[PDB]
């Protein structure tokens with residue numbers, strides 16, 4: 111009742127005829143999904159760039175917060191790797207990566223009310239919450255087109271990780287608020303550095 | 306087409322204004338979900354307590370089944386850790402843990418028909434099947450409110466583990482039924498002990 | 501508000517009364533799901549057998565492609581293990597394994613247009629794409645009956661792996677097409693062998 | 696004849712009065728130089744992005760050149776690190792990093808005349824020669840304003856490295872031209888991969 115060689119005729123002729131310009135791998139991988147992944151690639155790639163700008167801010171000699179600087183360089187590396195994993199899945203499924211423009215990020219993060227430390231961490235948290243929702247939207251599209259493979263990929267990977275990321279950033283914010291400017295920031299900068 | 310600093314304004318003002326009495330992390334985390342997790346926390350916590358009672362029963366000198374006793378102490382530790390993981394996710398997502406009352410468990414497990422061993426294992430199995438359904442219900446709520454992160458968390462963790470747990474308990478029951486009272490129980494108590 | 505010993509009465513009487521002819525473990529595990537797993541078992545088992553036939557083809561002294569032969573023996577072992585994992589889940593959930601007939605596979609793979617190497621790899625790819633869809637269908641049934649445990653099992657395991665498998669086979673095809681017959685096939689046979 | 700405490704009065708009052716909004720480190724570091732470094736940062740950052748696009752192209756299942764893909768991912772990491780070193784020098788000297796927009800890179804690299812391999816390597820070489828001149832221009836500005844520290848930094852670092860890079864890319868091009876399409880590309884893809 112299972113005749114593999116009759117059943118595979120469809121796929122077989124598809125494969126044997128395909129031009130070298132077509133992905134051979136693509137199976138039930140919707141254009142909208144393909145496009146949503148490119149979108150999310152661009153989102154991670156943008157956030158990586160923003161994080162890199164934050165790094166340069168804390169690297170400034172008069173800011174003197176090299177722990178925060180290290181933290182942001184790493185966050186930048188990490189977000190760029192998030193983009194890379196998405197690209198990897200894209201070509202894994204037969205989709206094609208489209209890389210989009212990156213806008214110039216903000217470079218200035220002085221803030222008299224909150225202090226640049228706390229402000230930057232509040233900005234970061236806010237960005238992470240935003241990306242959590244972006245990730246949620248990405249799986250929604252995946253779910254819409256009933257691509258269970260892509261759902262599993264998104265939710266077990268980035269989505270799940272983003273949860274941890276958000277909580278971690280919430281705590282930093284809570285800490286900066288608790289200890290206040292001056293010594294508190296210096297201490298937290300020390301902590302952020304050994305990580 | 307992606308302007309992070311315009312797009313983050315919503316999240317940013319939310320974060321910057323929040324009082325220290327609000328979770329900073331909570332994002333699309335429904336009260337009903339938050340409440341269902343507390344419920345399931347209480348269910349694991351209750352089952353841990355019941356398992357602890359079973360342990361004390363088999364610890365009684367005249368019962369003389371220290372392997373079963375060890376087995377139940379471990380099951381009790383394990384269920385309490387299940388509760389702990391749920392609590393961890395709760396505060397991870399910005400939800401708040403509510404711990405509920407624990408009813409006094411049954412302490413007596415003598416049974417003339419089946420023997421206390423077999424009976425206890427049938428009770429345990431029954432409890433595990435029950436909890437499998439509770440877990441199923443927990444993900445249903447998660448699914449209802451389209452919280453893919455929580456679904457992934459529930460199904461890849463406890464739900465999936467509960468499947469293994471149920472099968473493992475089914476086998477014990479099958480074994481006790483096979484070997485019958487006396488030597489069979491003593492042998493299985495030995496097995497349960499080295500685990 | 502949680503009385504475990506009242507709530508477990510249903511499950512308890514079910515368990516205590518069950519005959520030794522009934523699975524004790526089965527919980528909300530639909531017959532259609534049980535049957536779909538048997539189907540997918542048969543599909544992996546068939547593909548394993550086909551792969552074994554491919555192996556014997558490349559083992560022929562006049563074909564002289566022992567790397568391709570090794571590759572197919574391994575693919576055959578691997579697909580049979582896929583069947584075994586499905587069987588394992590089946591009895592894990594209380595379902596019963598039904599093993600179905602295996603049709604005689606094709607033994608001949610000479611092909612003048614493409615060459616047997618490329619042809620076999622195109623056949624393999626086609627089979628893998630086919631199985632990707634079969635796997636997709638399997639989770640659809642799981643999803644239909646709202647068995648989140650089985651969904652998680654299917655998508656995190658075989659489904660997700662099948663994605664990698666398809667891409668890997670696409671690349672082989674691309675390579676054979678690139679290097680053409682003769683030395684190209686000999687080189688790829690060498691590569692396939694050290695894997 | 697050297698009275699440090701009289702001679703340092705200038706620098707001392709400068710330092711003691713400076714607001715926390717000024718770099719404390721900046722010394723004879725011309726705006727034009729500061730701006731040229733930002734420019735060159737953007738150039739490395741752009742080339743990193745382009746290299747990342749090349750990577751995704753060779754990652755496509757139907758292209759099947761994972762060695763070239765690896766090569767470009769690494770080149771992309773490396774160029775981004777070049778940007779990072781420039782940023783590091785910028786804040787080292789008291790200058791401020793300005794990150795600029797990144798244009799969408801080309802994603803398509805099929806080429807019927809030369810083959811995508813050779814074409815991509817010719818593109819890469821061309822890009823590297825271009826960047827060699829950009830680097831030359833960067834030191835010219837440094838030289839113009841007689842900033843010997845920045846000259847030394849530029850010429851001993853990136854400039855000197857870019858020389859090696861250009862020669863290395865010339866050789867790849869020479870090799871692809873020598874071996875031609877098919878097996879030659881497959882062999883070179885193997886070489887590019889183990890690097």
Ligand SMILES: [Ca+2]
Nearest residue numbers: 262652655656
């Ligand atoms: Ca999943």
Ligand SMILES: [Ca+2]
Nearest residue numbers: 258261262655
């Ligand atoms: Ca799923």
Ligand SMILES: [Ca+2]
Nearest residue numbers: 262266461656
């Ligand atoms: Ca997963």
Ligand SMILES: [Ca+2]
Nearest residue numbers: 192241268272
């Ligand atoms: Ca992310």
Ligand SMILES: [Ca+2]
Nearest residue numbers: 262265266457
């Ligand atoms: Ca999942």
Ligand SMILES: [Ca+2]
Nearest residue numbers: 265453456457
């Ligand atoms: Ca899910």
Ligand SMILES: [Ca+2]
Nearest residue numbers: 266457461656
């Ligand atoms: Ca998971």
Ligand SMILES: [Ca+2]
Nearest residue numbers: 387436463467
């Ligand atoms: Ca549990």
Ligand SMILES: [Ca+2]
Nearest residue numbers: 457460461652
């Ligand atoms: Ca899942």
Ligand SMILES: [Ca+2]
Nearest residue numbers: 460648651652
């Ligand atoms: Ca699921």
Ligand SMILES: [Ca+2]
Nearest residue numbers: 266461652656
């Ligand atoms: Ca999983």
Ligand SMILES: [Ca+2]
Nearest residue numbers: 582631658662
């Ligand atoms: Ca499979």
Ligand SMILES: [Ca+2]
Nearest residue numbers: 846847850851
């Ligand atoms: Ca010098």
Ligand SMILES: [Ca+2]
Nearest residue numbers: 843844846847
């Ligand atoms: Ca010099």
Ligand SMILES: [Ca+2]
Nearest residue numbers: 847850851852
């Ligand atoms: Ca030097």
Ligand SMILES: [Ca+2]
Nearest residue numbers: 777826853857
């Ligand atoms: Ca360079």
